[PDB]
Structure 1
Amino acid sequence: GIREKIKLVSSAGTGHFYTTTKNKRTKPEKLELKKFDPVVRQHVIYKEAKI
């Protein structure tokens, strides 16, 4: 359905991402989450991007 895929990308400049879904119409504003980067081995901010 109208429920597209997205990378969340780490703010430490490892190119580690999580991938997840988002409704683009009902929420336009960009998704920002703390999550565990396993390369540096810390919790870190992760921001939206294109899959």
Structure 2
Amino acid sequence: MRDKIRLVSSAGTGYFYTTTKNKRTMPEKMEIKKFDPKIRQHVIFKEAKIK
């Protein structure tokens, strides 16, 4: 089953998105460009535990 994960801004603002992923087919950590509203720029977001 797909597991829930957080995508955390690399700008250090603490902003984050949430999504799901299949760990069997995507073992590596997700990295994707997303818009951060605290700094109003597009930056890289990285996978973290849903916690």
TM range (shorter): over 0.9
Question: Residues 11-36 of structure 1, C-alpha deviation per residue, up to 9 Å, x if partnerless?
Answer: 00011000000001111011100000
Aligned residue pairs total 50
TM-score, length-normalised on structure 2? 0.94
Any unmatched runs of 5+ in structure 1? none
Residues 3-18 of structure 1 correspond to what in structure 2 (within 5 A)? 3-18=2-17
Identity of aligned residues (%): 80
The aligned counterpart of 2:44 is 45
TM-score, length-normalised on structure 1? 0.94
SS of match in other structure, 2:42? strand
Any unmatched runs of 5+ in structure 2? none
